[PDB]
Ligand binder design. Structure first.
Ligand SMILES: NC(=O)c1ccc[n+]([C@@H]2O[C@H](COP(=O)([O-])OP(=O)(O)OC[C@H]3O[C@@H](n4cnc5c(N)ncnc54)[C@H](O)[C@@H]3O)[C@@H](O)[C@H]2O)c1
Ligand SMILES: NC(=O)c1ccc[n+]([C@@H]2O[C@H](COP(=O)([O-])OP(=O)(O)OC[C@H]3O[C@@H](n4cnc5c(N)ncnc54)[C@H](O)[C@@H]3O)[C@@H](O)[C@H]2O)c1
Ligand SMILES: NC(=O)c1ccc[n+]([C@@H]2O[C@H](COP(=O)([O-])OP(=O)(O)OC[C@H]3O[C@@H](n4cnc5c(N)ncnc54)[C@H](O)[C@@H]3O)[C@@H](O)[C@H]2O)c1
Ligand SMILES: NC(=O)c1ccc[n+]([C@@H]2O[C@H](COP(=O)([O-])OP(=O)(O)OC[C@H]3O[C@@H](n4cnc5c(N)ncnc54)[C@H](O)[C@@H]3O)[C@@H](O)[C@H]2O)c1
Ligand SMILES: [Zn+2]
Ligand SMILES: [Zn+2]
Ligand SMILES: [Zn+2]
Ligand SMILES: [Zn+2]
Ligand SMILES: [Zn+2]
Ligand SMILES: [Zn+2]
Ligand SMILES: [Zn+2]
Ligand SMILES: [Zn+2]
Lengths: 398, 398, 398, 398
């Protein structure tokens, strides 16, 4: 036994410690549909940062991480498509493939009460519900035949591992933000957020063939990653209206498509740039998206905030410019991305060299498992890095 | 001679008076593509009631009405598909058919500055912008070849005029609310609002083949029209939570599809049923719609409200349970319905006897022009009637 | 042990005989995802008739039937959503729920080589591949958690069993024919074929809210079932062009939507009505579907015909009016219906009393297992009945 | 003065001659909505070649050409969105924007009898019906406000005129072939045909973000344009089966998406590569497209062929492997592309430098009007050029 893991102990308190080796069981029942993986690469996410800041509650002693790439080392008796030694991508959604929502390709909202008895959605490292994260040496994956995405050729895949470690979550998430917003060839896109998800949303928009892709953020170092790769950027510390700043880049003060890659810990614009306000990103999108336009919201919004900037935000009640948005007949999509719907196509785009701008924009930094809390802390302070943990040293060395 | 019209003079002050006969002209500019209509039937809407209550601003002297069925009596030089004497349905949307949005079947948000120099949307009787309403003996209609839906068989159409008078606005609007929420055969649907729009949404859902259609309203008289036609109804004055009341009908406390047929003058639930709350209908739908579900919002929400219930609502900023909604990966569609997308199909459904229940749920009452301000008053006090004005005594049905 | 089954022995040679009790195994491997069902109701299909006529090859000793409703009597260790005693519907598609096509809600074309190693599709009673049919007392169903549709309340379901026995195959198939052809409220539909599938396609079109639903067939007794239920019919023995016959019913010589519920054993029109010609139904649809229209093809077309009317038809090569069809920018959908995509919604439509015309149109006749060959023979001679076998006498007696 | 035009006089007999200057008139009827254009650039198409070879009938004296970019020099009374001097792109589709099909964004199949009194479709230079082609100094364009795509920045547009001259027809057509086949990011695509249309399909697929784009042609020169730009190519003169040749490139003998950019004058494969067979491209796609896949057919197929290779082909009856296709549940889209649906977006993609590879694959050659019949002759003998006529010396690019 022995599994070294990133374990939650409290607000900004993460401890790398050895827990028992994962068994093929959940809630004291054998899972013959499940596999154990030896973790190849495992990233740190802005969703993990919500937990780290104490803005998303998990039980003390919960293992974090939901961006898993690994190798099958053990399987139950009902795993018929995965072999020991297979290199695979794990979607962050824990989904059964057997319930109504899974059968209608809506694995983002799995209804199976064995995945989550208290709500219709599953996720690693979020306690949704009771699935250990993958910021560890090993991890249990239920429903392996449905869940896992095989990287057919190990050698082809490992040479692009820094790109393919994003297939677990954030590229499909950013891409989903774009697709649900109707981003297509020749579209004009504004993305709120230049964290790892927003930078993936920008890369997804380019792959989709968008004409003008503009990204806004208060963080100039994160934005520089994008503008160096040919993307248009807006510094949101500027006091001039966002519409006017778009108008200077585009020739029009409005965009076809808006993508919210920020979430509930959003900040304001201009002199509000250092003020946390949960309606900051949303209301800016309602403002800049044109009549007949659409909005995707990959950024997380919670039904409960344990430490909100106002009382309403504590119950997920936000103060939203709905009337303005309604008048423009804007369409909105929300929620966890159904990674299973996009992961295969996005992998094909990477392996066939369609995304050379992805690594340029992502700023991947490979760290060890012991270095992870330092990574979280650096990320918490606005680092322009995407931290990827290599718990077995399988990624050579740079 | 003069054109007798319903004219707005102030809050709850409408006057049936003569206005100069309509010319084929707008802002002194000659309209080659336009037509004059002798009005056959012209309805009163909940949207007109917003104006009537002083909650939607139009200028003093503005002619009201946007639910027009009429006969062509005059045509400009560039009208090739309409003849004098043709019975037509007018979409409430003023739309050119020539701009980008119109060309992409989005006539709800016409971008033509000659239709509306400011916002991207056109509509009769809402000053959007400067198009006179059709609650009158005669009405100007621009871009006639694009705008108008001609009933091929005039006599057949006239025998179903009480159903077809709804083709101008509220049937396509309610139907759009359903379609945009993904209402399809076997669907479970909750509709907020049992006014004429909500009743048309219910009729549209039946036509779509929905399994279970539930309509909620604080108004009992309005709900009984639906009850008597085999629709499920919830009395929103009841103290019990809506989810549980839905549970009692359906067997599940959640629906596939939510339709908001109320708008910004919404009231609360149970003990707050006599209290106005602009978030009342929206938050109820965020609650009762299932994970993976969808919402259509045909009810109007405005960017500005002159007499709001709180200061935020004055600028169309609502307090919405966006977190609850987001967690369920719910999709939302908003805005004026693009009537042209649905009016032909819905006409065909009526003409071929697919909607016998429509007249049953609608409670059409036929009045004269002189009776119109009395119609508005009864409607404003919660009347279960759908008022249809007959300016030239052309209906004589009852 | 002991399982009395309809067994194929040759052209028009079916023998009811007792075979070994089904085990939870396939190709000498244990299936822990599978269940054994005690068969409640099991229908005879026009697809079975292809086998019976010797036009679709299965091995001698193959058990026929793919329209299964049953009760779970045994389950493997990885069946987590189905309980012993559950009343369930079995989609005719054998699908794994784990391959790429199944994950993208395309269970009609399962790629799993354990379902079918030789082609990307699975089906009971077709040797696709090696899955015994369900015209028997018991039947094995693989991948039970993904495959099966639970009828939650046994008592509610059994009172509608004559309707719900169609949920396994032909209602979803006919409905799929309509949906893929864009049948929606107010549509004008022509359906080729008034066998059980075509009569389900007509019932599906009504549920969808179609304005005019016209069905064509040479068989007048099958057509009478439809016209007695308010549908429009065309006798294809008539020598007048189909377009003109539609024009007499509709007012236009063309329809929005065409549905091919015939297949490769099609007959001609007029004096060709008694001549078998595999392009008979298809070319008629290419003729009567309007510009911008769409066609659904639920009727089976084979890549190999062992006894064709011409040499080309032996290799599935048909002589098709493609140019005529191309010029009208018509869209075509083909293939086995993905029953899993429609079965739940269609069940909801039945249980909520939305389809009272279905039984009126279907002409269900309940027979015993020993009476099955007589049923096949009667069906072969153009019987207007839908034969449903009750192998345990669970359907009372009429 | 006279309008110098390319005029059809018979098979392989075109004459550059003067014709009466265009009036704002059609069938002696005055056109308020129409415009006259001074032609900036006007291309030669494969569709013009069908006419040139005597395979598509037009009357003697008909003016050819339907790939028009021009400047507005005259406008009727009802043209409100175009000004004199405006640089515009003309969709090859003649479409009113006022009929049911046009109003539903289906301008490929305009139903207006004033556009075409017979079939539901309009096009310049194809006698559909009686609209003169744009291979001339001047051209009449009806319904200008609906039809025309105006380039906002005239100078910017002119600097990319060699790319934008394709916006009238072949780029939107090839792009439509891809989109209708479901080409999206990560897609594997096979395109039949490396003429200018097939090359635009390839460029469109790249813009869409396809992983693997394979183009087949018997013509090596035409394929090399694609090869040099990093596209995969298959020499169709090779004896090996196409599936296996695809296997060698892709790793699978099947593609997600098939595009037929050839049409009814298709040739065979391998040893039959110099043999004309109207089913050659279609059957290859029925073979190489996977189960659950889709096909787009931008290549023209006609209801009547005056010089067919067999009697069936004379009435547009083709011998198609429909059985093979059906078994794979493949979807098919056909017909003239609705250019208006794509032209704005594709323009935006060009203007924002998303298509540097377009000029690389297209091999634009600029010729004068006098050189046009020589252009047709070289093109007819398999030239890898895309011929663009410059009637007033307005391009001067090379
Ligand atoms: N839906 C899903 O499938 C799912 C999966 C993964 C991540 N997420 C979410 O995506 C979000 C993005 O996280 P991340 O990993 O990119 O790191 P992040 O949280 O650091 O990114 C947010 C960025 O947005 C910027 N920002 C703050 N206010 C803004 C505003 N008003 N307008 C524009 N930008 C603003 C911040 O400076 C920050 O750089 C998180 O909320 C995370 O929870 C959702
Ligand atoms: N989108 C469009 O194309 C468009 C077109 C026409 C009308 N509309 C809008 O539709 C809305 C309804 O129109 P109407 O003619 O039925 O007017 P209406 O005002 O008479 O109908 C609203 C009904 O909703 C009920 N209600 C109030 N609060 C509720 C709640 N919280 N939950 C459920 N029901 C509640 C009221 O009792 C009332 O009967 C109006 O806001 C109107 O402006 C929009
Ligand atoms: N795609 C699927 O999911 C799947 C599933 C089940 C059944 N099917 C197929 O559906 C088809 C229908 O079978 P069925 O069970 O209704 O019984 P059937 O085979 O008897 O029905 C065919 C009917 O069409 C009539 N017909 C013959 N030529 C015609 C023509 N040219 N135009 C119009 N009608 C014509 C016949 O008289 C006959 O009544 C069969 O081919 C079957 O294989 C496909
Ligand atoms: N749908 C539309 O909107 C529309 C518009 C424009 C053009 N088109 C049509 O598109 C087609 C192609 O146009 P083009 O300008 O490229 O003309 P083209 O004739 O020069 O291109 C056809 C190419 O296909 C090749 N070919 C022949 N048989 C083949 C096969 N079996 N498989 C693969 N390739 C094969 C030929 O060698 C040739 O290079 C024409 O039929 C044209 O009429 C349609
Ligand atoms: Zn994440
Ligand atoms: Zn699930
Ligand atoms: Zn209204
Ligand atoms: Zn417009
Ligand atoms: Zn069947
Ligand atoms: Zn499968
Ligand atoms: Zn062309
Ligand atoms: Zn038209």
């Amino acid at each position: 036994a022995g599994n070294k893991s990133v374990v939650y102990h409290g607000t900004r308190d993460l401890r790398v410690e050895t827990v028992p080796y994962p068994k093929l069981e959940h809630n004291n029942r054998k899972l013959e549909h499940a596999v154990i993986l030896k973790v190849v690469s495992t990233n740190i996410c802005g969703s993990d940062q919500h937990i780290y800041r104490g803005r998303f509650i998990v039980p003390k002693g919960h293992v974090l991480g939901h961006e898993i790439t690994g190798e099958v080392v053990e399987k139950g008796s009902d795993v018929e498509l995965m072999d020991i030694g297979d290199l695979v991508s794990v979607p962050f959604n824990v989904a059964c493939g057997r319930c109504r929502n899974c059968k209608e390709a809506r694995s983002d909202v799995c209804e199976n009460n064995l995945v989550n008895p208290d709500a219709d959605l599953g996720a690693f490292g979020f306690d949704l519900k009771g699935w250990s994260g993958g910021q560890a040496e090993y991890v249990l994956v239920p429903y392996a035949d449905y869940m896992l995405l095989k990287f057919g050729d190990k050698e082809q895949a490992m040479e692009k591992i820094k790109d393919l470690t994003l297939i677990s979550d954030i590229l499909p998430t950013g891409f989903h933000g774009c697709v649900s917003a109707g981003v297509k060839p020749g579209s004009h896109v504004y993305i709120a957020g230049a964290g790892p998800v927003g930078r993936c949303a920008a890369a997804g928009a380019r792959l989709l063939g968008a004409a003008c892709v503009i990204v806004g953020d208060q963080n100039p170092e994160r934005l520089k990653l994008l503008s160096d790769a040919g993307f248009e950027t807006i510094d949101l510390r500027n006091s001039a209206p966002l519409r006017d700043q778009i108008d200077q880049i585009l020739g029009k003060p409005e965009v076809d498509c808006g993508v919210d890659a920020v979430g509930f810990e959003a900040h304001g614009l201009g002199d509000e740039a250092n003020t946390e306000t949960p309606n900051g990103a949303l209301n800016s999108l309602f403002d800049v998206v044109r009549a007949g336009g659409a909005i995707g919201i990959p950024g997380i919004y919670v039904g409960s905030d344990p430490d909100p900037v106002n009382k309403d935000a504590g119950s997920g009640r936000l103060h939203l410019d709905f009337g303005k948005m309604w008048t423009k007949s804007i369409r909105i999509m929300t929620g966890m991305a159904p990674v299973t719907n996009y992961n295969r196509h996005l992998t094909e785009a990477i392996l066939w060299d369609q995304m050379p701008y992805l690594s340029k924009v992502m700023n991947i930094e490979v760290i060890t498992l012991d270095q992870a809390p330092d990574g979280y802390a650096k990320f918490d302070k606005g680092s322009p890095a995407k931290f990827v943990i290599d718990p077995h040293g399988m990624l050579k060395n740079k």
